[PDB]
Each structure stands twice: as C-alpha cells, then as structure tokens.
Amino acid sequence: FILSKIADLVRIPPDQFHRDTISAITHQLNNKFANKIIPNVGLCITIYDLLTVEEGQLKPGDGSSYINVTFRAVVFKPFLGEIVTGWISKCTAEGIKVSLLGIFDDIFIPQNMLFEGCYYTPEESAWIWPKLYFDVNEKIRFRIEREVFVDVKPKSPKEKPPAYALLGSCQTDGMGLVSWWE
Amino acid sequence: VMTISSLEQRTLNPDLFLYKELVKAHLGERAASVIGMLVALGRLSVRELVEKIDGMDVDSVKTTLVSLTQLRCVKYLQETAISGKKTTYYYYNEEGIHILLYSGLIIDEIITQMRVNDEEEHKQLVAEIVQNVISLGSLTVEDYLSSVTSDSMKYTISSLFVQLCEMGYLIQISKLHYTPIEDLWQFLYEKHYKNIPRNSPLSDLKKRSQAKMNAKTDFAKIINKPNELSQILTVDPKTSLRIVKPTVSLTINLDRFMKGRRSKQLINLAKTRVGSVTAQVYKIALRLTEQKSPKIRDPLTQTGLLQDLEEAKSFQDEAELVEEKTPGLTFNAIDLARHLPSASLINSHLKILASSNFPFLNETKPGVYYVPYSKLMPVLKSSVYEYVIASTLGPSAMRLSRCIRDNKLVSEKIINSTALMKEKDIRSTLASLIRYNSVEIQEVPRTADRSASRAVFLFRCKETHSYNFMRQNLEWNMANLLFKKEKLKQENSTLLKKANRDDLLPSELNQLKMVNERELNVFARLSRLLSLWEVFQMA
Amino acid sequence: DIEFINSLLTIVWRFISENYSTTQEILEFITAAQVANVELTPSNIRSLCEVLVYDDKLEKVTHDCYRVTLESILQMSKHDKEVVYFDEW
Amino acid sequence: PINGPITNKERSLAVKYINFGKTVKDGPXXXXXXXXXXXXXXXXXXX
C-alpha cells in the first residue's frame, strides 16, 4: 500500500445540489477509480482526502457543475522486493500461480529461480522437491521481483490480459509454507 | 503486418539520424538534441537552440556547448554586423563523430605501425596514453605529465612522446585549425579585395589575378602550418635528450590514419593482382613516401568556393601540376632492398611490377619511378565497385556492367549479340541492373518527338549516381547494426546492472553469454563495412 | 536460331589456363582452327575477345595481347545481420 | 556480407573499442581558458 497524489476534474449533476459539495465529489470520485487500474502508479483501492478545491465553471450547453480538484488516493504496491502472504489457485506446467485473497489473483511465479529440484508432472501431482511439496488451500509466502505494464484492447460487448501483473523469485529458504517453521 | 519489419524507420532518415545516433551512444539526451538539430537546420545560433525545442533553456545549452567544444563536435565561428553587437554561429564540425565511430581503429594502426621496435612495454603504455587523449579531446603536456606517478622513470612514458609526434599522427594544437573552409577562405580573402590605393581602372581582369594568386600563397602557408612544423616538437635543451615543448599541447590528425587504410585498399588490389612478395616490395616503398604524399588530402581547395566552367581546368590542372610537382620532384630515388625484418637487387621484382601496368600504378620518369596519385583513383574506384556488384548479385550482373562501359549509349540490338547468350535472361537481369539507378535510361524518341512507344533506347554513364548509392550504404547498415545492439542493452538492462554489481543461477549466465556473443560479432560487422565505405567517399 | 548462343559455352572452358599470349588476334586464329569442329571466319575474332573481355578471364596489355593474374585464385544471423541489399535509403 | 568469427585480432580491437567507450561514459578537472572567444562561455567554463 502507498498514497498517490493526483489531480482530476469532476462533473456533478443538478441532482446532488441538495447535498454538500465534499459529499458529492466523494461519491463521484468513487465511481471514477475504485477497483479500476490506474496506469503506471499501481492499483488503487480507496479515496482519502480532498484538497485545493476551487470555484467550478459552467459550459453553455449543459447546466451541470464542472470542478477541477486534486486529491490523494490510496493505491497498492509494496515495493520491488517485499514478501507478502498469499496462496496458489490454479496450475499447469509453467510455475505456480499464487493468489492473494483480498486484492487480485494476478501474481504468478513461474519456476526458473525457484529451488533446483522442482518439476511439474502430468500425473496430476502438482510439484515435487528433492523438501516435500504443497498444494492449493495452503498459505504461501511469495517475494516480489519483476513488474510489467501494458495497454488495453478495445472493449467487446456480449488472451493477453496483463493489466496489472507481478512476479517474483522465492529461492531463499523458508518460503511457500508457514508450517515448516514452529 | 505488425510493423516489426522496420518499415517505419526505413523511409524518413537519410544521413541525419546517423550523427545523433552515435552521439546518443556517446552521451545521449541533450547531446543528441543539439547535434541532431545542428544537422537538420544547418547553421545555428546560441539563442536559436532555445526557441525550437524548448530544451530546458540555458541549463542544457551552456552545459552541452562546452561539452561539444572539448571534443570539438561543433565548428565555431564568430563575427559582427554593420548594425552592431556580435554573433556566434555553430556548424557541424568536419567529421568528429566518425572519429568517435573510429576510436580503437585509429589506435590499432597506432600500435601496429609503431614497430621497427620489437614487442616492448610500449603496448600497455601508449594504450593508456592514447585512450586519455581522444577521450579528453585535448591534452596539455605538463598537466598530463603530472598524472604520471613519481619516484619512477619520468621519460619512460616520454620514451615515446616525442616519438608520438613522429612524422604523422599527433600534431600540436594551433589557433583556428577548426574553422569552416568557406569562412576561412573569405576571412583570408580580406586584404585582397581591400587592397588597392585607387590604383587604376585598367584591365579589370587583373583584379582576378591579384586576389587569387595572393590568396593561394596565403592559403598554402595556413594549410601547411599544421602539416609539417619542426619548431615545437624538435626542441632540444641541454642536460637531456630531444624533448617536446612542455607548453604547447597536441591533437591527433587525419594525416597517416586515413593514409594507412588507403594503402590497405591499394594492398588489397595489389595482393589480388600479384604475389605476396610483390605486395611487400610495393609496401616498403609506400611506408617511406607516405609523408609527403597528399592522397586523402588531395583537393583541399574544393570545399568553400566555385570551380568554374572555363577556368575549371585552370583550377584543376593547377592542382594537377602541383600533383605532378611534389610526387615527381621530392620523392625517393631508387634504393636497393632497404632493410626488412632474395639477395642482390630486388628491382627485378619491380620490373615484373613494371612490365605489367594496367590497371594501376607503373608510371615512370627517366631515372626515377613512382605511382601517380591522380590517375590511380579511377582504376581504384572501378575495381572495388565491380567487386561490390560481384558480391551482392550473381555472375550475370557483373558482365553486363562493363558491357555498358566498353562502348557508350547503344541499343539492345548490338547488346543482345555482343553480351553473352540469351535474350529473356538478359531482359531479366537488365531489370535487375536498371532496378536501382546507375544505368539511367536514355532520352530519345524514334521519329515520334517524345510522343509514344517503340522509340530507341540507350544505356549510358552516370558515375556519381552509381557512386552515391554506395553512400546510402553508409548509415543504414551501421544504423540497425548499432541500434538493435543498443536495443539489446535496454532490454537486458536489468541483467547488466545485476552483472555490474556482481563484478549465480543457471539461467542468468545463459543470457550473459548471449549478449556478449552478439556484442562481439556486431562490432566485427561494423568495422567490416566500415572499411568498405571509406573507399567510396572519394570520386 | 536456337543452335546459336549455345556454342560459346563449351570450347572456351579450359583453353584459358594454357594461355603471355602474343598477338591477341592470332589467339583467335589459334582458337578459330582447332578440334576440327572449327567455326568459320574473323567474325569470331571480335567475339570471344569483346564478350569474355570482362568477368575475369584475361587482362588487357599493349601490343595486342592478353595477360593472366587473379583468375588463378578463383579457379583454385542471430538478431540483425546483413541482408546486403534493397532497403532504399 | 561473408565474415563470421574471423580475425581474433579484430575481436581484440572490438573489445578495446568497448573499453574505451566505457571510460568516456564514466567521465564528464581543469579545461582552463582554452580557445574560448566568448566571455559569456568563458564564465561558464570556469566551473
């Protein structure tokens, strides 16, 4: 988690005139970002405070209220090398894909830098170490290494979806299972 | 599809991007900006840099200025106007970026031709000395001598210093040596137009002879000033051996570096047409006589002024007679097997280099023999160019090229007959020949007066257009070469930074060997076509 | 017709190596009469002369004759490299 | 064209070329007053 500082312009309809500005701008800003991904600054969660707000203007052919304000929104990314709790979900032979419940399943760690004795089997047995192994529903500690950013394809109303994707290297001992200790 | 074929970058950057590409690898960012703009718009003013780009005014400009000055990447000129104040205009300076493209290639010939000594400490010594020269762009003797460690031999590094001045190579820093050839001619043209005390309005054509002849003799003293001067370098105070002036600084030069490779091109032609021994006999002659041989320096008056229609020869042959003068007069009398690292007289091996003249050399005066630097170039450009078409396309493309060069401007009637064999395959490679320029197409109708088809056709001339297409081979080869080498960096940048901090894992060492492989080979490809371009820059 | 242009690809093959060869026009007068398959006339004097004149073969030296020098030698990409043509620029 | 892994000497020349380039990138201390004809540039050349 980290706190970004950004600016933006808000359009509030006549329907919200009965309430207070700060309350109106709040709801609007919530409909703006929320769960949506903000480019290059990481993924955003919620909104914090409101500053710099000034007199809003009006365009001739509408009748609404356009206000340009800046605010600090709470976003998400720990840092380059942080270790954080999670667990795997799905799998094939590439590497394990660890999902942190509460943010996204986007985290995926292929097996390259992992322990020297790891291999996938078609036998439906997930993975094997020369110690032991584990599977889904069990908590996993994973470290961050690499981060990538891409653009988006046009939306199609009724695969390459790497909107926000993080991967890492777990080779340092004591990772992937918390009951090995204690 | 997907544009990955690099059709995007293909069309829009002839010349141009070449320059700011090399300085980007050199420095990058702001450094590429100024030079790249200095090319496109040509002549540039200090204030003018700010207007166009909005380049972070006066912080970058003053920083880049002195940065380009030390390595002399900008041609400097200052003057004034009849109105007042002052103005300073910058030009793209000679080729200084080509020298940055050279680098070790220059130092190569420096190391290689520094022998006649045998395998000494010189290797590790001057490698450190020369690399300090080109990098800083200018070196004063004393401040550099201060960099040398104490309580040791001080003249060990000065064992070869006065030997760096040598004959060619490093010369002194002098004054206006960097200067537009057009401008210095105009600045020197003063005191010529200016000179007459209301003499007499007779024979207006004498103003020609006055200014010209007085300019030529004043031009000669300026160009021969950096060439050979024994004043500074040969200074020999007592209580020591010959030692170069501690005050006056030095700089490298175009003289023997451009000469060394030019001889190689002659050797490659020699070695092809004669034995290995004959190439050596012809080599030992060139090594001694390369000093007073203008060669690469030949025109020297060309850039910066008009030639003529009428007086073109009277200009040209005036140079040709001094190209007759110096080689004939000054150059060595017949020697016998000088030193070297076949007994008696080796002139018999010259006689087999004599009896066979065509295509090249073998010009003789009674009592003295030497190779012309004028008539040698046409047959030098011929061979190499013919070998280019030989390399690129098959054997069929070769034969037809000279077929047009035997006679001139004829139709397919006598061509089909006299060329080789078959019509259809000739028309095939005729289209491949006429594909990119170089034969043009003739201009004339058959009784149609330009009207319509069935008119007669002829294939003719066009040398310079069959030249410049080898000047398009200059940048676009080295471009993608160097570029995708640089793109190989930023892609592996995360790896390289990890490698530098390390100076682990199976797959990390894999991509480490990968880039290094590509690195080596791509520099070997660079120097390859580098030697190919250098011969095509003249005539 | 078709018989023509196919007759010049044979008799000129190995005769080169056996050639200083004096009197360049006699060189034909030699070649013109040989193998008993001999062709006809001086029309072949300027034939193999001014056809084979280029593409290595024999050098051109004065007093009408032919030399030999460099023909004896010939008778004896990961990421981005070469492609050595086109591309305009 | 042609080429390939030829002339180890040239490879050494290539290695040197890379080494010389690295030294320039690392570099930017006197430079003095030399050759400056501009008083405005000479003032900035002091530092």
mmCIF file of C-alpha atoms in Angstrom, chain B residues 9-10 13 272-274 355-356 358 386-387 392 398-399 402 406 418-422 435-436 472 475-476 480-481 484 488 517-518 521 525, chain C residues 4-6 8-9 20 46-47 50-56 59-62 67 69-70 73 78-82 84-89:
data_model
loop_
_atom_site.group_PDB
_atom_site.id
_atom_site.type_symbol
_atom_site.label_atom_id
_atom_site.label_comp_id
_atom_site.label_asym_id
_atom_site.label_seq_id
_atom_site.Cartn_x
_atom_site.Cartn_y
_atom_site.Cartn_z
ATOM 1 C CA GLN B 9 12.128 3.780 -39.657
ATOM 2 C CA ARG B 10 13.112 2.946 -43.234
ATOM 3 C CA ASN B 13 16.052 9.372 -42.161
ATOM 4 C CA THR B 272 44.872 -9.726 -55.645
ATOM 5 C CA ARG B 273 46.807 -8.929 -58.821
ATOM 6 C CA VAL B 274 50.303 -10.047 -57.746
ATOM 7 C CA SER B 355 56.010 -4.689 -67.486
ATOM 8 C CA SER B 356 52.508 -5.263 -66.129
ATOM 9 C CA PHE B 358 47.168 -1.943 -66.304
ATOM 10 C CA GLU B 386 32.858 -4.012 -59.710
ATOM 11 C CA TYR B 387 33.547 -6.332 -56.776
ATOM 12 C CA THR B 392 25.743 -8.692 -53.979
ATOM 13 C CA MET B 398 28.885 -8.357 -63.376
ATOM 14 C CA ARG B 399 29.349 -8.982 -67.105
ATOM 15 C CA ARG B 402 31.274 -3.354 -68.124
ATOM 16 C CA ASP B 406 33.127 -0.610 -73.111
ATOM 17 C CA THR B 418 27.732 -8.937 -78.036
ATOM 18 C CA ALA B 419 26.841 -9.574 -74.382
ATOM 19 C CA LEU B 420 26.651 -13.323 -73.781
ATOM 20 C CA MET B 421 23.856 -15.705 -74.699
ATOM 21 C CA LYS B 422 20.110 -15.345 -74.199
ATOM 22 C CA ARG B 435 16.418 -1.688 -60.726
ATOM 23 C CA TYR B 436 18.383 0.838 -58.703
ATOM 24 C CA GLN B 472 23.412 5.209 -48.856
ATOM 25 C CA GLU B 475 24.345 4.790 -42.468
ATOM 26 C CA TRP B 476 21.513 2.290 -42.941
ATOM 27 C CA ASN B 480 20.190 -1.077 -37.456
ATOM 28 C CA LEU B 481 23.523 -2.657 -36.566
ATOM 29 C CA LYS B 484 19.430 -3.092 -32.267
ATOM 30 C CA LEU B 488 19.826 -5.237 -26.850
ATOM 31 C CA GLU B 517 28.308 -13.004 -28.288
ATOM 32 C CA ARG B 518 26.055 -10.599 -30.197
ATOM 33 C CA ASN B 521 30.104 -10.135 -33.700
ATOM 34 C CA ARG B 525 30.410 -6.418 -38.735
ATOM 35 C CA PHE C 4 23.286 -20.173 -81.884
ATOM 36 C CA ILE C 5 24.350 -18.848 -78.423
ATOM 37 C CA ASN C 6 24.774 -22.416 -77.135
ATOM 38 C CA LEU C 8 30.065 -20.414 -76.954
ATOM 39 C CA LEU C 9 29.625 -22.174 -73.606
ATOM 40 C CA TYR C 20 51.728 -14.160 -72.002
ATOM 41 C CA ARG C 46 35.870 -9.903 -82.041
ATOM 42 C CA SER C 47 33.526 -12.465 -80.493
ATOM 43 C CA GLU C 50 34.857 -8.476 -76.642
ATOM 44 C CA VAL C 51 32.471 -10.872 -74.878
ATOM 45 C CA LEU C 52 34.801 -12.539 -72.371
ATOM 46 C CA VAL C 53 36.689 -9.217 -72.099
ATOM 47 C CA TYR C 54 35.061 -8.700 -68.691
ATOM 48 C CA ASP C 55 34.358 -11.155 -65.841
ATOM 49 C CA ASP C 56 37.973 -12.034 -65.029
ATOM 50 C CA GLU C 59 43.981 -8.929 -68.747
ATOM 51 C CA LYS C 60 44.446 -6.337 -71.485
ATOM 52 C CA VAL C 61 48.037 -5.282 -72.150
ATOM 53 C CA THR C 62 49.599 -3.383 -75.070
ATOM 54 C CA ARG C 67 47.793 -11.396 -69.558
ATOM 55 C CA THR C 69 46.689 -12.636 -62.918
ATOM 56 C CA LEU C 70 43.767 -13.056 -60.489
ATOM 57 C CA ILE C 73 42.762 -17.605 -57.314
ATOM 58 C CA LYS C 78 21.072 -14.066 -34.659
ATOM 59 C CA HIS C 79 19.290 -10.745 -34.149
ATOM 60 C CA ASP C 80 20.035 -8.437 -37.084
ATOM 61 C CA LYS C 81 22.716 -9.037 -39.726
ATOM 62 C CA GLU C 82 23.345 -8.418 -43.416
ATOM 63 C CA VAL C 84 23.024 -6.807 -48.075
ATOM 64 C CA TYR C 85 20.603 -5.038 -50.490
ATOM 65 C CA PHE C 86 17.410 -3.065 -51.156
ATOM 66 C CA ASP C 87 16.026 -1.157 -48.141
ATOM 67 C CA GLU C 88 16.392 2.039 -50.224
ATOM 68 C CA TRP C 89 17.958 4.842 -48.149
#
